[PDB]
């Protein structure tokens, strides 16, 4: 699935910690639970934050540099030493028996996948007039847009969707095609580039009722 940045922000506590980095959303809760010391501070303090600036794209490990004091290459950790980072000097307590760093152990600490962009859909329930703005990832199939909208109407499954596809006529939308395939384009970049407010026009999704019993 996918997550908007705000959705990642909802979990910021040592009890439920989510971090987004390099396009991936990670639930580091069991880490903080199993490693509770001064090591866990720099990422507790960035719970629910975006952690991509720590790392580099070419390799999945954090950035490295030549340490000015010892002149030995090691991770650049201005924030502090996060879990799975070796101490600068030869110690007697940092074991290397553990398998993989948490930024490499995707299978055990990654859930979902961070959205690279988000858009505003204005959903309108045609039977009982109830407008509603909402933010959804700009790359998602209508099934999960319906899943997002299920918090607005608990009976949205029975309803049928419709969009102003192109002249322009309100036509049906296939569920498995994303908002861009179905003909609902995104124009916020053009809005910005042309000095038009990003809340001036919003694409609209009509939601009619399908009688059932």
């Amino acid at each position: 699935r996918y997550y908007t940045p705000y959705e990642v922000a909802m979990h910021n506590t040592p009890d439920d910690c989510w971090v987004s980095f390099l396009g991936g959303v990670y639930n580091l809760t069991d880490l903080i639970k199993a490693n509770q010391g001064a090591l866990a501070a720099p990422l507790i303090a960035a719970a629910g934050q975006d952690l991509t600036h720590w790392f580099d794209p070419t390799t999945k490990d954090p950035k490295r540099h030549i340490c000015p004091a010892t002149h030995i290459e090691r991770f650049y950790t201005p924030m502090g030493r996060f879990i799975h980072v070796p101490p600068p000097e030869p110690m007697c307590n940092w074991d290397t028996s553990f398998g993989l760093p948490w930024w490499r152990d995707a299978k055990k600490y990654q859930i979902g996948l961070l959205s690279a962009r988000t858009r505003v859909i204005r959903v309108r329930n045609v039977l009982t007039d109830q407008e509603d703005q909402i933010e959804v990832p700009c790359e998602e199939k209508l099934v999960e847009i319906r899943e997002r909208y299920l918090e607005l109407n608990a009976h949205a499954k029975s309803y049928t969707w419709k969009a102003l596809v192109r002249t322009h006529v309100f036509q049906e939308l296939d569920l498995n095609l994303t908002l861009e395939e179905n003909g609902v384009p995104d124009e916020t970049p053009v809005f910005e580039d042309h000095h038009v407010p990003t809340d001036y026009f919003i694409p609209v999704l009509h939601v009619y009722w399908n009688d059932d019993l």
């Binding site: 909802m10 109830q130 109407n153």
Partner: protein, 51 residues
């Protein structure tokens, strides 16, 4: 008349869901921002008290 009754029932239920959603939305919107500010300010507090 049965069709009209069903339509009116659904209208009413959607109207009620709107209000309940509004209340819960307000609660969660305030809670998340409170948690974020608590994070930042408590980090500052701990640093200063340590110093």
């Amino acid at each position: 008349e049965a069709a009209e009754r069903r339509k009116l029932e659904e209208k009413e239920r959607r109207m009620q869901q709107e209000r309940e959603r509004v209340e819960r939305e307000r609660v969660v919107r305030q809670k998340v921002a409170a948690s974020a500010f608590a994070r930042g300010y408590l980090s500052g507090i701990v640093n200063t008290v340590f110093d």
